[PDB]
Amino acid sequence: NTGRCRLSSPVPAVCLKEPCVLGVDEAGRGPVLGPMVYAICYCPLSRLADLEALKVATLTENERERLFAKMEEDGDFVGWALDVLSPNLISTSMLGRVKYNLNSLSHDTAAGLIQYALDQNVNVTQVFVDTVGMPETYQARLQQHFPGIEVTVKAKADSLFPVVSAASIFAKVARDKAVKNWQFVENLQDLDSDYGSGYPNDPKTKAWLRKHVDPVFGFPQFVRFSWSTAQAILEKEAEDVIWEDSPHRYFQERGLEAASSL
Amino acid sequence: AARQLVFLLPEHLKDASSLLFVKLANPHSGEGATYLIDMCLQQLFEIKVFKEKHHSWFINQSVQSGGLLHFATPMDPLFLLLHYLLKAGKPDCTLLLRFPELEKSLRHVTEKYYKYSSEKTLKWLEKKVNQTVVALKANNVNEDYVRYAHGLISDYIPKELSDDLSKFLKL
Amino acid sequence: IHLRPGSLRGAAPAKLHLLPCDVLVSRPAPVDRFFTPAVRHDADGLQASFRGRGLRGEEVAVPPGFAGFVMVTRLIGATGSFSHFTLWGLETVPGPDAKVHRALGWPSLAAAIHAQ
């Protein structure tokens, strides 16, 4: 696993011969807490009618789970793959000396999951990717990378194409099984897991982070250190840390000087 | 918590078969510096510090700021004993020179009666440059060494500005 | 300031990390809760994280014929003993031509300068 973690269903045989259509979507782009999940759902152009039903446009946690199992049942034709990204990998990526923002971390993650499908010999002929605002530049980078297929990027994709609507579901469902798994362990180890929504705009989430600042180390793994809310709390609550980027010659070249101090 | 020091001490200091940190005058330039002196085995060591911008230590279950690494490296008392006479030209200072094999070492730069000699010192300092040229070849510090090897002894003596005539022209 | 070989001879092992960052205040810290369980091994040294930043490490040895000690305060006695330490770098392992790796070359040269 290491930083990220990929979970995947075996490729249904139909998908290796029949022309396929693929849907890319995510969950967890925005919280301070927990992972960011990416999901691809693919299915034959012929079997699109079967998915037109399991398509919304909202759908509660219970209904999401139900629709997730309904798709998981019909694994004879619907294929899926997930890449669950840790708050730590998100922290480390964005806090490198080399700038590497969420959007880049996000989309590179989309590229890999679409690439996985290709490497699995899924007869992908058309990809649809959901986005947040202005789809253009995203289509440009994505189409340029995948020149053998049509790549469509629309902000309303989770509402236009059932395959994106399905990818939205696995991603949301995986995002909730991952936070429940952390909560379960938290509670086992008698730790406080009452954070709230997970978003930095939540008074209860803000409160939780404030109650959880080790002066030396800051927060536990779960916290996306790279978030401004996260950083801002560490500036007020933890010890100040200065990083690398915030003859008389020999000793100067090694960093050596005499001890007057002692 | 209390300030923790990170030392690199010679392997032998450990065994008994007695140890004092004495503030002594810096022979090159400076009012003072730290010197560790062996009283049982009767020897001198200088204290250098590794300080580099933005480092700290995790020492066991604690953090120590700064990231300093202190070194106790054997010192030749000849450099430290030079300042008692050097001013003539023709505090803890006391225990510093008084040791066995002192008089036999003193007959290198100076000479009951002790008299400083400029001739012997230049001959001795020139030998050190070559002695440290051997080390710079073994340790491989990145001919051209002539200027560099002379410079290293300058950080131990103020007579190296008077040995700037000893640079290129030997004396 | 003076101290016998007693503290030196009987100093207990200590675990040292040299961070590429300065934690401005000296204090106890739960290294074993936060730090240690983040450390991982691979073909090129170790990986761990601090304040959400990716660090890359390496075990660095105390010079040959030398001994590492942690000393607390006149009189100054040794609290820990080490023979090696972890040298952390940001995103990329500190290079061989780094200030730290150059200081460790000092005792070897110091023996030649001060040789009788």
Swiss-Prot record, chain A:
Disulfide bonds: none annotated. A divalent metal cation binds at D25, E26, D130. It is found in: Nucleus. Changing E26A: Loss of enzyme activity. Keywords: Acetylation, Endonuclease, Hydrolase, Metal-binding, Nuclease, Nucleus, Phosphoprotein. InterPro entries: RNase_H2_suA, RNase_HII/HIII, RNase_HII/HIII_dom, RNase_HII_hlx-loop-hlx_cap_dom, RNaseH-like_sf, RNaseH_sf. Manganese or magnesium. Binds 1 divalent metal ion per monomer in the absence of substrate. May bind a second metal ion after substrate binding. One of its GO terms (biological process) is mismatch repair. NCBIfam families: ribonuclease HII. Catalytic subunit of RNase HII, an endonuclease that specifically degrades the RNA of RNA:DNA hybrids. Participates in DNA replication, possibly by mediating the removal of lagging-strand Okazaki fragment RNA primers during DNA replication. Mediates the excision of single ribonucleotides from DNA:RNA duplexes. This is Ribonuclease H2 subunit A.
From Swiss-Prot, chain B:
It comes from Mus musculus (Mouse). Non catalytic subunit of RNase H2, an endonuclease that specifically degrades the RNA of RNA:DNA hybrids. Participates in DNA replication, possibly by mediating the removal of lagging-strand Okazaki fragment RNA primers during DNA replication. Mediates the excision of single ribonucleotides from DNA:RNA duplexes. One of its GO terms (biological process) is fibroblast proliferation. The keyword Acetylation applies. This is Ribonuclease H2 subunit B. Its main location: nucleus. The gene is Rnaseh2b. Keywords: Acetylation, Nucleus, Phosphoprotein. The keyword Ion transport does not apply. It is found in: Nucleus.
Swiss-Prot record, chain C:
InterPro entries: RNase_H2_subunit_C, RNase_H2_suC. This is Ribonuclease H2 subunit C. Keywords: Acetylation, Nucleus. Its main location: nucleus. Coiled coil: none annotated. Belongs to the RNase H2 subunit C family. It is found in: Nucleus. It comes from Mus musculus. Non catalytic subunit of RNase H2, an endonuclease that specifically degrades the RNA of RNA:DNA hybrids. Participates in DNA replication, possibly by mediating the removal of lagging-strand Okazaki fragment RNA primers during DNA replication. Mediates the excision of single ribonucleotides from DNA:RNA duplexes. The RNase H2 complex is a heterotrimer composed of the catalytic subunit RNASEH2A and the non-catalytic subunits RNASEH2B and RNASEH2C. GO terms for cellular component: nucleus; ribonuclease H2 complex. The keyword Acetylation applies. It comes from the Eukaryota. One of its GO terms (biological process) is mismatch repair.
